[PDB]
Amino acid sequence: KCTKNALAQTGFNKDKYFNGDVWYVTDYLDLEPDDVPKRYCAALAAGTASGKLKEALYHYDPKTQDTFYDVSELQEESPGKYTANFKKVEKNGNVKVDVTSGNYYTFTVMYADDSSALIHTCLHKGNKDLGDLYAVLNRNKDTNAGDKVKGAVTAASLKFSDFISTKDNKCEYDNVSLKSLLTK
Numbered sequence: 001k002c003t004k005n006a007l008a009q010t011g012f013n014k015d016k017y018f019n020g021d022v023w024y025v026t027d028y029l030d031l032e033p034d035d036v037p038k039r040y041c042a043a044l045a046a047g048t049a050s051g052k053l054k055e056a057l058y059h060y061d062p063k064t065q066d067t068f069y070d071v072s073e074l075q076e077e078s079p080g081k082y083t084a085n086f087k088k089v090e091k092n093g094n095v096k097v098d099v100t101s102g103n104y105y106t107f108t109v110m111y112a113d114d115s116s117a118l119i120h121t122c123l124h125k126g127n128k129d130l131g132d133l134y135a136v137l138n139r140n141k142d143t144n145a146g147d148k149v150k151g152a153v154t155a156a157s158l159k160f161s162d163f164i165s166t167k168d169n170k171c172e173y174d175n176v177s178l179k180s181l182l183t184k
C-alpha cells in the first residue's frame, strides 16, 4: 500500500523543474524494501517535448552492472502531482515493454529549488501497489542535502537519518541518453 496524502509544493515552479535537465537521487527512503539487499543508483530528466511533459528514468546496479531506462508522458493531476504511464526502452528509445494500463507511477514534488528537490513516488506495476518511495534529488550528483531539503523532509514528518545515501554506491550515469530519451 502507498500514501496519497503527500503534499505538493505551494508555489511549485514547473518551468524550473521541467527544464530537460537531469536530477540525481542522492538519498532515498523505501517504506517497503525488498527482502534481497541491493545497491541503488537512479537519475531522471524531466522536461517537455512536442507539447507534453516527459520524464526519462534511469536505474543502475553498481554490483551487477545492470541498467534500465523508462520514458513516460506525464499528466498533471494538480501542480506538483503527476501520473506517469511508463514504457521500458533501450538507451536508444527501442521499446522493451510497451505502455500498459496497470503500469504507472505517481509522484509528488514536495519541495524544489534550482538545485534540489524532495519527491514522493508511488510505483504501481500491474494493479499492484509496489510501495512508498521518498527521494532527495540534486542537480549535482556530489552534493550533500542542504538545510532546505532537510527542513522539507522534517516538514513531511520523516527523519533524514532514516534516508540512505547513494553517494557511496560507486554509481555511473548516462545523462546523454537520459536527455535524448525525452523526445522518445
Ligand code: HEM
Residues within 6 Å of the ligand: 025, 028, 030, 038, 040, 041, 042, 043, 044, 057, 059, 069, 070, 086, 087, 088, 097, 105, 107, 121, 123, 125, 135
Ligand atoms: C527517482 C525516483 C524513482 C522513480 C520515479 C522510480 C520508478 C520506477 C519505475 C518506473 C520502475 C519500473 C521499471 C520498469 O520495469 O519498466 C522502477 C523499478 C525499480 N526501482 Fe525505481 N524509481 C525511482 C527510484 C528508485 C530508487 C532510488 C531505488 C532504490 C530503492 C529504486 C529501486 C527500484 C527497483 C529495485 C526496481 C525494479 C522493480 C521491478 O522491476 O518491479 N527506484 N522504478
Ligand SMILES: [C-]#N
Residues within 6 Å of the ligand: 123, 133
Ligand atoms: C522504484 N521504485
